[PDB]
């Protein structure tokens, strides 16, 4: 293994740069049936440990692999059960480790009754004069931590680790949308008669992903349409429409259908 030599040689921002580890990942760590992916992932935790955005934003790009293999094998053949706490540690370092406080995401709604950077409400008639203006709403917060990943908040944690990708869209590479949207394309219809048409191989189990996970994965597909990945994102979002129709989640079929009526 070339990456084995890499781990043998490594173990201060100049150490960031690297395309040799991705190709040697293609020729060494294409197979997930090796249990030495665990500590190097912790080494990927080291690249996540510091505040350097570079090591994060192009060494974070292989975790959906271990989500599908490690988590599809684990959360259903042997399995260790450790990197759920590594991803959970990433969750803790996302909700807490900015300065030492928990993260409370909250925007404020605009208004047509308010002067703003783009318009004026004063010279216009009595339509938009009068509604809760200049008021704030909360959309993600507050959110406590978790010690070890269990099945109550496995998809809450997965949900906000996906919300980490809801803030770092443009910095992604195309391969991230490739594997991320193929694996996220197969997680949704995995235990249904739709994967029979998709013929996506793997375990034939229905994964109980939740509604928020589907919304904040629809934002990701919606970023995947507009980087050349057209047909994969199209069939993926169609699968989300099907899963939302059988599962009767309103808002993912709401959003995804709004995508279906928003493509040329």
């Amino acid at each position: 293994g070339v990456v084995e030599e890499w781990l043998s040689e490594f173990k201060l921002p100049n150490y960031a740069t690297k395309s040799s580890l991705v190709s040697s990942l293609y020729k060494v760590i294409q197979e997930p049936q090796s249990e030495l992916l665990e500590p190097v992932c912790h080494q990927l935790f080291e690249f996540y440990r510091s505040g350097e955005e570079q090591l994060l934003q192009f060494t974070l790009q292989f975790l959906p692999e271990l989500i599908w293999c490690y988590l599809a094998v684990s959360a259903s053949v042997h399995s260790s059960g450790c990197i759920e706490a590594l991803l959970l540690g990433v969750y803790n370092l996302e909700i807490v480790d900015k300065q030492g406080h928990t993260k409370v995401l909250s925007f404020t709604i605009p208004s047509l009754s308010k002067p703003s950077v783009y318009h004026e409400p004063s010279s216009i008639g009595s339509m938009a004069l009068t509604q809760h203006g200049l008021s704030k709403v909360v959309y993600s917060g507050p959110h406590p931590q978790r010690e070890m990943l269990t099945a109550q908040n496995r998809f809450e944690v997965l949900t906000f680790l996906l919300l980490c990708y809801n803030a770092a869209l443009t910095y992604m590479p195309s391969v991230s949308l490739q594997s991320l949207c193929q694996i996220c394309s197969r997680i949704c219809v995995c235990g249904y008669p739709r994967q029979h048409v998709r013929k996506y191989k793997g375990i034939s189990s229905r994964i109980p992903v939740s509604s928020g996970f589907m919304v904040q994965m629809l934002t990701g597909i919606y970023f995947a349409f507009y980087n050349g990945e057209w047909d994969l994102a199209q069939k993926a979002l169609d699968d989300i429409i099907y899963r939302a129709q059988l599962e009767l989640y309103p808002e993912p079929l709401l959003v995804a259908n709004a995508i279906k009526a928003s493509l040329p």
Partner: protein, 728 residues
């Protein structure tokens, strides 16, 4: 002098119907103004007749352009004008060169005249119009031949800023109609920028064209640019790749350096009362709220007497808008506001299905259930080809609304219409029949509906081999049917599908508490709580199973543990009040299980504080009145509960048992018969009635009632099987 102020008043307003009258007046002095005014009146008159088209051929020879050639070569020939009017005559000359198809000499003119040394402050409007169209025409002359990108920056960015200056200018004058070159200079810049991959200056030019104050003729342009910018805000950009419109773009970005800075720009919004969106979603929300207002301004509302092709674009554009709103308020989970937005969108759809349906899902995701059922009725009226619509209506009718009759009708309309949906059709029809079975009065009707739901659940179980809800709710309806090992088989099929479920493991443990496998079921609750700790109902199952094979101490430990979990998860909504009351009453059941009336009196008093007229609380109060040896008080509270819910069973059991004690055998007979009519599947009803029959002597039906109670006791769980919810 003053004649130049009146004619200047006509030229600043761009009035092209009086100019031949003005040169008909203008007098004695020999000038060259008439050739420029009439020639520009004939070029602008030709634009008022035949405007220029995009992707046009090199024109010529045209007699009207030969006239303009006479005017321009005459004004340039004599030279009885100012130098800047000869400059603009060279600009219309080079414009003639662009229309006719001249390439090199046009660029020779635009390199010679010079517009950037011509000032921008205190400039008359027609000068800004001719010179601005010379910016656009100049860039076109730069582009029709093979850093030229910097020239696009120059002529097109200056064309944009000074064009906005002309539009705010003319609105400034008229308060004191769109052209081709305005569209060329405004659109061509950013369009080429996204052709180049110049994302940063694309967003920059968008925010430049948007931070300008609204011109009444740019409202189309502002709406379209708010649409496109909203698109790129939602499909290419994140919050880390975001910068405020008051701020600077980065230099090394995945999505160039400014060269110049003009002497004058348009009116840019700023001040202290402005709002600056600090992330891309807020700015998209502003762009699309503006686009929603302008979408109603541009709406025809399908008047359609004879007006269709000028309507469908007004509909499709708004569709793009509200789809973007759906993504915007969707990824942020703000669905009540989404329902208000689409509710503002509903002025369009007369038969247009997509708007009704997205509106319906919008009402559904935001907890609005009744209106959602109405809208789904209208969506059935529009498109009967979809089962998802009456399926969702059936979901909301059997949910919090509890419209079982309606749920039956919608389910029938599903059955009238692959197997993965019709399986849900018989599933919703079956859950509907089961919920109707619970809420019926007679025994026979209840058994009819039970057999109906049992049949429908068999149908949905056949139609789908990979459905944990067909197998599971089939096992649950069979569990209400008291046939235990079969329901256990289907539960083994459910956990065979998914072994990490709350209700499936819960039904496994309850059935194992029905076959009296105590530590087995308690271990199932141990695993099910080891993976689902904060689940309340599994904790109640732990309470009851610990009451079976553990005793009262560990049960009280679990009860206070659930006090820790309720105080943990909550401080609010209604049902946590009831869950707490469940904790107090289960603990009180433990203290009764020991035989300690005061502690249970405290527990049921703390529950009584929550819901004073709850029949379960009155029932526990009656049990305590049984513990303190007051049969009259217990009778009183047991009649307290039977006016709250006359269909409650246990109060009739212990009440009529008191009546069996107090000798009034008639009332015990009656009330036990009515308790048979409400629910004949509760064994202690048959114990009490059987002992009234033993108090009457009719030992045949007496031993039949005791055998009834024995068999029902053989089919009895720890917690009643209706505790696992019947929800799609």
């Amino acid at each position: 002098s003053r004649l130049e102020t009146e004619i200047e008043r006509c030229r600043s307003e761009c009035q092209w119907e009086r100019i031949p009258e003005l040169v008909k007046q203008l007098l004695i002095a020999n000038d060259d103004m008439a050739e420029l005014l009439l020639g520009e009146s004939k070029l602008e008159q030709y634009l008022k007749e035949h405007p220029l088209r995009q992707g046009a051929s090199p024109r010529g020879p045209k007699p009207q352009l030969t006239e303009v050639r006479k005017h321009l070569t005459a004004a340039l020939d004599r030279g009885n004008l100012k130098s800047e009017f000869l400059q603009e005559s060279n600009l219309i000359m080079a414009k003639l060169n662009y229309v006719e198809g001249d390439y090199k000499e046009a660029l020779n003119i635009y390199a010679r005249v010079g517009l950037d040394d011509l000032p921008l402050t205190a400039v008359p409007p027609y000068r800004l119009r001719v010179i601005a169209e010379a910016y656009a025409t100049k860039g076109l002359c730069l582009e029709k031949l093979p850093d030229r990108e910097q020239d696009v920056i120059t002529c097109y960015e200056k064309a944009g800023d000074i064009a906005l200056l002309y539009l705010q200018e003319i609105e400034r004058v008229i308060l004191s109609e769109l052209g081709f070159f305005l569209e060329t200079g405004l659109q061509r810049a950013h369009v080429l920028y996204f052709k180049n991959g110049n994302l940063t200056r694309g967003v920059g030019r968008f925010r430049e064209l948007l931070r300008a104050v609204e011109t009444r003729t740019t409202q189309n342009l502002r709406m379209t640019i708010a649409r496109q910018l909203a698109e790129i805000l939602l499909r290419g950009m994140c919050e880390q790749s975001y910068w405020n419109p008051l701020e600077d773009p980065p230099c090394q970005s995945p999505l160039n350096t400014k060269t110049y800075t003009l002497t004058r720009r348009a009116r840019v919004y700023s001040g202290e009362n402005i709002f600056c969106p600090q992330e891309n979603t807020e700015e998209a929300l502003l762009l699309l709220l503006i686009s929603e207002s302008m979408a109603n301004r541009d709406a025809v509302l399908s008047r359609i007497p004879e007006h269709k092709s000028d309507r469908l674009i007004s509909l499709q554009s708004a569709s793009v808008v509200y789809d973007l709103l759906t993504i915007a308020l969707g990824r942020r989970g703000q669905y009540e506001m989404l329902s208000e937005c689409l509710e503002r969108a509903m002025k369009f759809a007369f038969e247009e299905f997509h708007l009704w349906y997205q509106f319906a899902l919008s009402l559904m995701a935001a907890g609005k259930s009744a209106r959602a059922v109405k809208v789904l009725k209208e969506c059935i009226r529009l498109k009967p080809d979809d089962a998802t619509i009456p399926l969702l209506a059936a979901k909301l009718c059997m949910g919090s609304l509890h419209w079982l009759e309606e749920a039956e009708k919608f389910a029938k309309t599903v059955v009238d219409v692959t197997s993965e949906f019709k399986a849900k059709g018989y599933l919703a029809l079956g859950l509907t029949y089961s919920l109707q079975a619970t809420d019926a009065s007679l025994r026979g009707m209840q058994e009819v509906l039970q057999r109906k739901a049992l049949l429908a659940f068999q149908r949905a179980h056949s139609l789908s081999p990979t459905d944990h809800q067909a197998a599971f709710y089939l096992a649950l309806q069979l569990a209400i049917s008291r046939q235990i090992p079969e329901a256990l088989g289907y539960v083994r099929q459910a956990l065979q599908l998914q072994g990490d479920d709350a209700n499936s493991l819960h039904l496994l443990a309850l059935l194992l508490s029905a076959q009296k496998h105590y530590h087995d079921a308690l271990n199932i609750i141990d695993m099910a709580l080891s993976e689902y700790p904060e689940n309340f109902i599994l904790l109640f199952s732990k309470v009851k199973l610990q009451s079976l094979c553990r005793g009262p101490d560990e049960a009280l430990l679990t009860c206070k543990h659930m006090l820790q979990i309720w105080k943990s998860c909550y401080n609010g909504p209604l049902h946590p009040w009831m869950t707490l009351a469940q904790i107090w009453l289960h603990a009180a059941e433990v203290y009764i299980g020991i035989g300690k009336p005061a502690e249970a009196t405290a527990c049921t008093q703390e529950a009584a504080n929550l819901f004073p007229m709850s029949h379960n609380v009155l029932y526990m109060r009656g049990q305590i009145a049984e513990l303190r040896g007051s049969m009259d008080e217990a009778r009183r509270w047991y009649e307290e509960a039977l006016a709250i819910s006359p269909t409650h069973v246990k109060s009739m059991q212990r009440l009529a048992l008191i009546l069996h004690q107090l000798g009034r055998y008639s009332l015990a007979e009656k009330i036990l018969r009515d308790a048979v009519q409400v629910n004949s599947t509760a064994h202690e009803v048959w114990n009490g009635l059987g002992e009234v029959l033993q108090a009457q002597g009719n030992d045949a039906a007496a031993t039949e009632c005791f055998l009834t109670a024995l068999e029902l006791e053989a089919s009895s769980p720890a917690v009643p099987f209706t505790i696992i919810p019947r929800v799609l």
